[PDB]
Amino acid sequence: SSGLVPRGSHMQFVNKQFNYKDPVNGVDIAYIKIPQMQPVKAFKIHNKIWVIPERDTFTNPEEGDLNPPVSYYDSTYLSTDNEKDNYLKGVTKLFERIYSTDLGRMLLTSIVRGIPFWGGSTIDTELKVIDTNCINVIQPDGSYRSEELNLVIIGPSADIIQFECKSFGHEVLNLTRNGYGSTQYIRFSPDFTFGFEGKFATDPAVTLAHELIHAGHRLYGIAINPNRVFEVSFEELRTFGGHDAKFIDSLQENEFRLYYYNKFKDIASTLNKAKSIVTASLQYMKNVFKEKYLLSEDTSGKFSVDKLKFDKLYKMLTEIYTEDNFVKFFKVLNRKTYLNFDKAVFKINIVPKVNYTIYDGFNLRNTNLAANFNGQNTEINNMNFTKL
Ligand SMILES: O=C(CS)Nc1cc(-c2ccc(Cl)cc2)n[nH]1
Numbered sequence: 001s002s003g004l005v006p007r008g009s010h011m012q013f014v015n016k017q018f019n020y021k022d023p024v025n026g027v028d029i030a031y032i033k034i035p036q037m038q039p040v041k042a043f044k045i046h047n048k049i050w051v052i053p054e055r056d057t058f059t060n061p062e063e064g065d066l067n068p069p070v071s072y073y074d075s076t077y078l079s080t081d082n083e084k085d086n087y088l089k090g091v092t093k094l095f096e097r098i099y100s101t102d103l104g105r106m107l108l109t110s111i112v113r114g115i116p117f118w119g120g121s122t123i124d125t126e127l128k129v130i131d132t133n134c135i136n137v138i139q140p141d142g143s144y145r146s147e148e149l150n151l152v153i154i155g156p157s158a159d160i161i162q163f164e165c166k167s168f169g170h171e172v173l174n175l176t177r178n179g180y181g182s183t184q185y186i187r188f189s190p191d192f193t194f195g196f197e198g199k200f201a202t203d204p205a206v207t208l209a210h211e212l213i214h215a216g217h218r219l220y221g222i223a224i225n226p227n228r229v230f231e232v233s234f235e236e237l238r239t240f241g242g243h244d245a246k247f248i249d250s251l252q253e254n255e256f257r258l259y260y261y262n263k264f265k266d267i268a269s270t271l272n273k274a275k276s277i278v279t280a281s282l283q284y285m286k287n288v289f290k291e292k293y294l295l296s297e298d299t300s301g302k303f304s305v306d307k308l309k310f311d312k313l314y315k316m317l318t319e320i321y322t323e324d325n326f327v328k329f330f331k332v333l334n335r336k337t338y339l340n341f342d343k344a345v346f347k348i349n350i351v352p353k354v355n356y357t358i359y360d361g362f363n364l365r366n367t368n369l370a371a372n373f374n375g376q377n378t379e380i381n382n383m384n385f386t387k388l
Protein backbone atom coordinates (compact mmCIF):
# COMPACT_ATOMS: atom_id res chain seq x y z
CA SER A 1 0.00 0.00 0.00
CA SER A 2 1.18 3.49 -0.93
CA GLY A 3 -0.41 5.55 1.85
CA LEU A 4 -1.32 8.35 -0.55
CA VAL A 5 -4.39 9.43 1.45
CA PRO A 6 -3.38 9.22 5.14
CA ARG A 7 -6.28 11.52 6.16
CA GLY A 8 -9.62 11.97 4.44
CA SER A 9 -11.21 10.20 1.52
CA HIS A 10 -9.11 11.51 -1.38
CA MET A 11 -5.77 13.16 -2.10
CA GLN A 12 -5.99 16.91 -1.52
CA PHE A 13 -3.87 18.23 -4.41
CA VAL A 14 -3.38 15.45 -6.99
CA ASN A 15 -6.68 14.82 -8.77
CA LYS A 16 -6.54 11.05 -9.38
CA GLN A 17 -4.57 8.07 -8.17
CA PHE A 18 -3.24 7.36 -11.61
CA ASN A 19 -1.79 4.09 -12.78
CA TYR A 20 0.68 4.46 -15.63
CA LYS A 21 -1.34 1.84 -17.57
CA ASP A 22 -4.59 3.76 -17.18
CA PRO A 23 -6.23 4.46 -20.56
CA VAL A 24 -5.66 7.70 -22.40
CA ASN A 25 -8.71 9.93 -22.34
CA GLY A 26 -7.60 13.36 -23.63
CA VAL A 27 -8.42 15.08 -20.33
CA ASP A 28 -5.93 14.08 -17.61
CA ILE A 29 -4.32 10.99 -19.19
CA ALA A 30 -3.06 11.69 -22.67
CA TYR A 31 -0.37 11.60 -25.30
CA ILE A 32 1.14 15.08 -25.58
CA LYS A 33 3.91 16.86 -27.49
CA ILE A 34 6.07 19.87 -26.65
CA PRO A 35 6.04 22.59 -29.37
CA GLN A 36 9.76 17.39 -33.39
CA MET A 37 9.43 14.45 -31.01
CA GLN A 38 7.29 11.30 -30.68
CA PRO A 39 4.05 11.51 -28.67
CA VAL A 40 4.62 10.91 -24.97
CA LYS A 41 2.06 9.67 -22.44
CA ALA A 42 1.51 12.22 -19.68
CA PHE A 43 -0.62 12.60 -16.57
CA LYS A 44 -2.35 15.80 -15.52
CA ILE A 45 -2.06 15.71 -11.73
CA HIS A 46 -3.64 19.14 -11.14
CA ASN A 47 -4.87 22.15 -13.08
CA LYS A 48 -1.86 23.60 -14.98
CA ILE A 49 0.49 20.76 -13.91
CA TRP A 50 1.38 17.68 -15.96
CA VAL A 51 3.65 14.73 -15.20
CA ILE A 52 5.67 13.02 -17.93
CA PRO A 53 6.94 9.68 -16.46
CA GLU A 54 9.73 9.52 -19.04
CA ARG A 55 13.41 10.35 -19.26
CA ASP A 56 13.79 13.84 -20.73
CA THR A 57 15.07 13.58 -24.30
CA PHE A 58 12.69 16.32 -25.50
CA THR A 59 13.39 19.72 -23.98
CA ASN A 60 16.93 20.19 -25.29
CA PRO A 61 17.63 18.95 -28.85
CA GLU A 62 21.30 18.72 -27.76
CA GLU A 63 20.20 16.26 -25.02
CA GLY A 64 18.35 13.57 -26.98
CA ASP A 65 20.41 10.60 -25.71
CA LEU A 66 20.99 9.04 -22.28
CA ASN A 67 24.70 7.90 -22.36
CA PRO A 68 27.64 9.73 -20.83
CA PRO A 69 29.87 12.08 -22.90
CA VAL A 70 29.46 15.49 -9.99
CA SER A 71 27.18 13.06 -11.88
CA TYR A 72 25.62 9.60 -12.37
CA TYR A 73 24.29 7.75 -15.44
CA ASP A 74 22.10 4.73 -16.23
CA SER A 75 20.23 4.32 -19.53
CA THR A 76 18.19 1.49 -17.99
CA TYR A 77 16.46 3.82 -15.54
CA LEU A 78 12.79 4.56 -16.21
CA SER A 79 12.56 2.54 -19.46
CA THR A 80 9.97 -0.04 -18.34
CA ASP A 81 6.34 0.53 -17.42
CA ASN A 82 6.60 -0.62 -13.79
CA GLU A 83 9.20 2.13 -13.42
CA LYS A 84 7.00 4.79 -15.02
CA ASP A 85 4.22 3.76 -12.63
CA ASN A 86 6.60 3.86 -9.64
CA TYR A 87 7.77 7.33 -10.64
CA LEU A 88 4.28 8.66 -11.29
CA LYS A 89 3.37 7.45 -7.82
CA GLY A 90 6.54 8.82 -6.22
CA VAL A 91 5.92 12.28 -7.64
CA THR A 92 2.28 12.07 -6.57
CA LYS A 93 3.14 11.17 -3.01
CA LEU A 94 5.57 14.06 -2.73
CA PHE A 95 3.08 16.66 -3.97
CA GLU A 96 0.72 15.38 -1.30
CA ARG A 97 3.59 15.62 1.19
CA ILE A 98 4.32 19.20 0.24
CA TYR A 99 0.63 20.14 0.28
CA SER A 100 0.38 18.54 3.74
CA THR A 101 2.27 21.59 5.06
CA ASP A 102 0.94 25.14 5.29
CA LEU A 103 3.98 26.43 3.38
CA GLY A 104 3.45 23.88 0.61
CA ARG A 105 -0.20 24.83 0.16
CA MET A 106 0.79 28.49 -0.15
CA LEU A 107 3.50 27.61 -2.70
CA LEU A 108 1.50 25.24 -4.88
CA THR A 109 -1.41 27.68 -4.89
CA SER A 110 0.88 30.47 -6.02
CA ILE A 111 2.27 28.23 -8.79
CA VAL A 112 -1.13 27.23 -10.18
CA ARG A 113 -2.22 30.89 -10.15
CA GLY A 114 0.93 31.99 -11.98
CA ILE A 115 -0.32 31.68 -15.55
CA PRO A 116 2.40 32.74 -18.02
CA PHE A 117 1.54 36.15 -19.35
CA TRP A 118 0.02 36.57 -22.81
CA GLY A 119 2.78 38.68 -24.32
CA GLY A 120 3.12 36.76 -27.56
CA SER A 121 1.76 39.53 -29.78
CA THR A 122 3.61 42.09 -31.87
CA ILE A 123 0.62 44.46 -31.69
CA ASP A 124 0.52 46.43 -28.44
CA THR A 125 -3.29 46.56 -28.52
CA GLU A 126 -3.54 42.77 -28.67
CA LEU A 127 -3.25 40.03 -26.07
CA LYS A 128 -2.01 36.70 -27.42
CA VAL A 129 -0.58 33.54 -25.88
CA ILE A 130 3.01 32.42 -26.31
CA ASP A 131 2.69 28.91 -27.73
CA THR A 132 5.82 27.60 -25.98
CA ASN A 133 3.74 28.02 -22.81
CA CYS A 134 1.55 25.21 -24.18
CA ILE A 135 1.44 21.50 -24.88
CA ASN A 136 -0.63 19.78 -27.54
CA VAL A 137 -2.95 17.20 -26.02
CA ILE A 138 -4.06 14.36 -28.26
CA GLN A 139 -7.65 13.22 -27.75
CA PRO A 140 -8.93 9.63 -28.00
CA ASP A 141 -10.09 10.27 -31.59
CA GLY A 142 -6.66 11.53 -32.66
CA SER A 143 -7.23 15.29 -32.66
CA TYR A 144 -4.96 17.76 -30.88
CA ARG A 145 -5.85 20.74 -28.78
CA SER A 146 -3.36 23.31 -27.52
CA GLU A 147 -3.54 23.53 -23.72
CA GLU A 148 -1.75 26.06 -21.54
CA LEU A 149 0.03 24.82 -18.44
CA ASN A 150 2.35 26.18 -15.79
CA LEU A 151 4.42 23.22 -14.70
CA VAL A 152 5.71 19.96 -16.09
CA ILE A 153 7.54 17.37 -13.99
CA ILE A 154 9.62 15.13 -16.27
CA GLY A 155 12.32 12.54 -15.74
CA PRO A 156 16.01 13.39 -15.92
CA SER A 157 18.21 13.37 -19.01
CA ALA A 158 21.41 11.33 -19.35
CA ASP A 159 22.60 12.71 -15.99
CA ILE A 160 20.07 11.18 -13.62
CA ILE A 161 21.25 13.29 -10.67
CA GLN A 162 20.94 16.64 -12.47
CA PHE A 163 17.72 18.25 -11.26
CA GLU A 164 16.71 21.64 -12.63
CA CYS A 165 13.79 23.94 -13.41
CA LYS A 166 14.13 25.14 -17.00
CA SER A 167 11.89 26.66 -19.60
CA PHE A 168 11.69 27.78 -23.20
CA GLY A 169 12.88 31.28 -24.01
CA HIS A 170 11.64 33.96 -26.39
CA GLU A 171 13.65 35.47 -29.24
CA VAL A 172 13.48 38.93 -27.72
CA LEU A 173 11.85 38.46 -24.29
CA ASN A 174 13.49 37.24 -21.11
CA LEU A 175 10.30 35.68 -19.84
CA THR A 176 11.68 34.49 -16.50
CA ARG A 177 12.94 37.99 -15.71
CA ASN A 178 10.41 40.51 -17.12
CA GLY A 179 7.39 39.52 -15.02
CA TYR A 180 5.67 37.49 -17.75
CA GLY A 181 6.81 34.04 -16.73
CA SER A 182 6.70 30.92 -18.85
CA THR A 183 5.92 27.21 -18.57
CA GLN A 184 8.45 25.53 -16.28
CA TYR A 185 9.85 22.02 -16.67
CA ILE A 186 11.40 20.27 -13.68
CA ARG A 187 13.82 17.44 -14.42
CA PHE A 188 13.34 15.41 -11.26
CA SER A 189 13.50 11.88 -9.98
CA PRO A 190 11.79 10.63 -6.79
CA ASP A 191 13.89 7.48 -7.12
CA PHE A 192 17.30 8.81 -6.08
CA THR A 193 18.57 11.31 -3.53
CA PHE A 194 21.72 12.92 -2.14
CA GLY A 195 23.83 12.25 0.93
CA PHE A 196 25.21 14.70 3.46
CA GLU A 197 27.22 14.09 6.62
CA GLY A 198 26.57 10.25 10.63
CA LYS A 199 25.87 9.91 6.92
CA PHE A 200 22.33 10.94 5.98
CA ALA A 201 20.16 11.36 2.91
CA THR A 202 18.23 14.38 1.65
CA ASP A 203 14.44 13.95 1.90
CA PRO A 204 13.15 14.09 -1.70
CA ALA A 205 10.16 16.27 -0.76
CA VAL A 206 12.70 18.98 0.12
CA THR A 207 14.38 18.60 -3.25
CA LEU A 208 11.14 18.75 -5.21
CA ALA A 209 10.17 21.75 -3.07
CA HIS A 210 13.46 23.38 -4.04
CA GLU A 211 12.71 23.11 -7.75
CA LEU A 212 9.15 24.32 -7.26
CA ILE A 213 10.54 27.45 -5.61
CA HIS A 214 12.50 28.11 -8.77
CA ALA A 215 9.28 27.41 -10.67
CA GLY A 216 7.50 30.08 -8.63
CA HIS A 217 10.19 32.70 -9.24
CA ARG A 218 10.26 31.86 -12.92
CA LEU A 219 6.47 31.76 -13.33
CA TYR A 220 6.16 35.34 -12.08
CA GLY A 221 9.14 36.43 -14.14
CA ILE A 222 11.12 37.60 -11.12
CA ALA A 223 14.09 35.27 -11.40
CA ILE A 224 17.64 36.44 -10.78
CA ASN A 225 19.76 36.34 -13.90
CA PRO A 226 22.08 33.29 -13.65
CA ASN A 227 25.07 35.53 -14.40
CA ARG A 228 24.79 37.09 -10.94
CA VAL A 229 26.89 34.57 -8.95
CA PHE A 230 29.35 34.34 -6.10
CA GLU A 231 30.05 29.28 -8.68
CA VAL A 232 26.83 29.57 -6.70
CA SER A 233 24.20 31.83 -8.26
CA PHE A 234 22.08 34.31 -6.32
CA GLU A 235 18.99 32.47 -7.54
CA GLU A 236 20.24 29.33 -5.78
CA LEU A 237 21.07 31.19 -2.55
CA ARG A 238 17.62 32.81 -2.52
CA THR A 239 15.90 29.49 -3.12
CA PHE A 240 17.82 27.79 -0.31
CA GLY A 241 17.04 30.59 2.14
CA GLY A 242 18.12 30.38 5.75
CA HIS A 243 21.36 32.19 6.33
CA ASP A 244 22.59 31.52 2.77
CA ALA A 245 20.14 34.17 1.52
CA LYS A 246 21.60 36.88 3.80
CA PHE A 247 24.76 36.83 1.67
CA ILE A 248 22.85 38.14 -1.36
CA ASP A 249 24.07 41.68 -1.96
CA SER A 250 22.55 43.98 0.55
CA LEU A 251 20.68 46.62 -1.44
CA GLN A 252 20.93 44.94 -4.83
CA GLU A 253 18.07 42.78 -3.65
CA ASN A 254 16.33 46.09 -3.01
CA GLU A 255 17.26 46.90 -6.61
CA PHE A 256 15.67 43.59 -7.62
CA ARG A 257 12.35 44.58 -6.04
CA LEU A 258 12.20 47.97 -7.75
CA TYR A 259 13.16 46.41 -11.08
CA TYR A 260 10.38 43.85 -10.97
CA TYR A 261 7.90 46.24 -9.38
CA ASN A 262 8.40 48.27 -12.54
CA LYS A 263 8.17 45.15 -14.68
CA PHE A 264 4.78 44.56 -13.06
CA LYS A 265 3.71 48.09 -13.93
CA ASP A 266 4.72 47.46 -17.54
CA ILE A 267 2.43 44.44 -17.49
CA ALA A 268 -0.41 46.49 -15.97
CA SER A 269 0.01 49.16 -18.66
CA THR A 270 -0.12 46.42 -21.29
CA LEU A 271 -3.40 45.00 -19.95
CA ASN A 272 -4.96 48.46 -20.03
CA LYS A 273 -3.97 49.04 -23.68
CA ALA A 274 -5.40 45.65 -24.63
CA LYS A 275 -8.31 46.18 -27.02
CA SER A 276 -8.35 42.83 -28.84
CA ILE A 277 -7.52 39.17 -28.24
CA VAL A 278 -6.89 36.25 -30.60
CA THR A 279 -12.06 32.70 -27.43
CA ALA A 280 -12.27 34.07 -23.86
CA SER A 281 -13.29 37.70 -23.53
CA LEU A 282 -10.57 40.30 -23.44
CA GLN A 283 -12.29 40.95 -20.12
CA TYR A 284 -11.69 37.40 -18.93
CA MET A 285 -7.95 37.28 -19.65
CA LYS A 286 -7.40 40.72 -18.17
CA ASN A 287 -8.97 39.40 -14.96
CA VAL A 288 -6.83 36.25 -15.07
CA PHE A 289 -3.73 38.40 -14.79
CA LYS A 290 -5.40 40.81 -12.38
CA GLU A 291 -5.70 37.80 -10.08
CA LYS A 292 -2.17 36.54 -10.83
CA TYR A 293 -0.30 39.76 -10.09
CA LEU A 294 -2.73 41.14 -7.49
CA LEU A 295 -3.47 44.14 -9.68
CA SER A 296 -5.80 46.82 -8.41
CA GLU A 297 -8.74 47.97 -10.51
CA ASP A 298 -10.47 51.32 -10.13
CA THR A 299 -14.12 52.15 -10.83
CA SER A 300 -12.93 53.04 -14.33
CA GLY A 301 -11.31 49.67 -15.07
CA LYS A 302 -7.69 50.83 -15.13
CA PHE A 303 -5.13 48.39 -13.73
CA SER A 304 -2.21 49.39 -11.53
CA VAL A 305 0.22 47.80 -9.09
CA ASP A 306 -0.28 48.46 -5.42
CA LYS A 307 3.15 48.78 -3.83
CA LEU A 308 2.08 46.84 -0.73
CA LYS A 309 0.52 43.89 -2.49
CA PHE A 310 3.53 43.75 -4.77
CA ASP A 311 5.78 43.66 -1.71
CA LYS A 312 3.73 40.94 -0.05
CA LEU A 313 3.66 38.85 -3.24
CA TYR A 314 7.33 39.32 -4.00
CA LYS A 315 8.26 38.70 -0.37
CA MET A 316 6.18 35.52 -0.43
CA LEU A 317 7.86 34.09 -3.52
CA THR A 318 11.46 35.07 -2.73
CA GLU A 319 11.88 34.90 1.06
CA ILE A 320 9.10 32.76 2.49
CA TYR A 321 9.14 29.99 -0.15
CA THR A 322 12.60 28.64 0.60
CA GLU A 323 14.17 25.23 0.98
CA ASP A 324 15.10 26.09 4.58
CA ASN A 325 11.53 26.91 5.58
CA PHE A 326 10.38 23.60 4.09
CA VAL A 327 13.05 21.80 6.12
CA LYS A 328 11.47 23.48 9.12
CA PHE A 329 7.87 22.53 8.33
CA PHE A 330 8.93 18.99 7.39
CA LYS A 331 11.07 18.73 10.54
CA VAL A 332 13.69 16.75 8.67
CA LEU A 333 17.48 16.92 8.66
CA ASN A 334 18.96 18.86 5.74
CA ARG A 335 22.39 20.11 4.83
CA LYS A 336 22.90 23.52 6.45
CA THR A 337 24.19 25.46 3.43
CA TYR A 338 23.73 25.08 -0.31
CA LEU A 339 27.19 23.53 -0.65
CA ASN A 340 27.42 20.87 2.09
CA PHE A 341 26.25 18.13 -0.28
CA ASP A 342 28.77 15.31 -0.09
CA LYS A 343 28.98 12.94 -3.04
CA ALA A 344 26.74 10.11 -1.95
CA VAL A 345 23.93 9.14 -4.32
CA PHE A 346 21.35 6.62 -3.13
CA LYS A 347 18.61 4.66 -4.82
CA ILE A 348 15.40 4.83 -2.81
CA ASN A 349 11.76 3.77 -3.03
CA ILE A 350 9.40 6.20 -1.30
CA VAL A 351 6.17 4.73 -2.72
CA PRO A 352 5.85 1.91 -0.17
CA LYS A 353 4.13 3.37 2.87
CA VAL A 354 6.39 1.08 4.90
CA ASN A 355 9.32 3.12 3.59
CA TYR A 356 8.12 6.67 3.69
CA THR A 357 4.93 8.52 4.46
CA ILE A 358 3.31 11.76 3.42
CA TYR A 359 3.54 13.15 6.94
CA ASP A 360 6.85 11.75 8.24
CA GLY A 361 8.97 11.17 5.16
CA PHE A 362 11.42 8.45 6.18
CA ASN A 363 11.31 9.24 9.90
CA LEU A 364 8.40 6.96 10.65
CA ARG A 365 6.52 7.91 13.79
CA ASN A 366 6.38 5.49 16.72
CA THR A 367 9.20 3.42 15.26
CA ASN A 368 12.95 3.17 15.52
CA LEU A 369 13.19 5.79 12.82
CA ALA A 370 11.27 8.64 14.51
CA ALA A 371 14.05 9.82 16.85
CA ASN A 372 17.25 11.65 15.89
CA PHE A 373 16.33 11.49 12.17
CA ASN A 374 17.13 7.77 12.06
CA GLY A 375 14.93 7.16 9.01
CA GLN A 376 17.31 9.48 7.13
CA ASN A 377 20.46 7.84 8.53
CA THR A 378 21.69 5.78 5.58
CA GLU A 379 23.31 3.26 7.91
CA ILE A 380 20.64 2.82 10.59
CA ASN A 381 17.88 2.77 7.95
CA ASN A 382 20.16 1.23 5.29
CA MET A 383 17.08 -0.79 4.29
CA ASN A 384 15.77 2.37 2.55
CA PHE A 385 19.00 3.57 0.92
CA THR A 386 21.21 1.79 -1.61
CA LYS A 387 24.53 3.54 -2.16
CA LEU A 388 25.77 3.89 -5.74
O1 LIG B 1 20.99 22.34 -7.39
C1 LIG B 1 20.76 22.45 -8.59
C2 LIG B 1 20.06 23.65 -9.18
S1 LIG B 1 18.28 23.48 -8.93
N1 LIG B 1 21.07 21.53 -9.49
C3 LIG B 1 21.52 20.33 -9.11
C4 LIG B 1 22.38 19.91 -8.12
C5 LIG B 1 22.44 18.52 -8.27
C6 LIG B 1 23.24 17.60 -7.42
C7 LIG B 1 24.03 16.63 -8.01
C8 LIG B 1 24.78 15.77 -7.21
C9 LIG B 1 24.75 15.90 -5.83
CL1 LIG B 1 25.72 14.80 -4.79
C10 LIG B 1 23.96 16.89 -5.24
C11 LIG B 1 23.21 17.74 -6.04
N2 LIG B 1 21.64 18.15 -9.30
N3 LIG B 1 21.06 19.31 -9.84
Ligand SMILES: [Zn+2]
Pocket residue numbers: 210211214236239
Ligand atom coordinates in the same frame (compact mmCIF):
# COMPACT_ATOMS: atom_id res chain seq x y z
ZN1 LIG C 1 18.27 25.17 -7.34
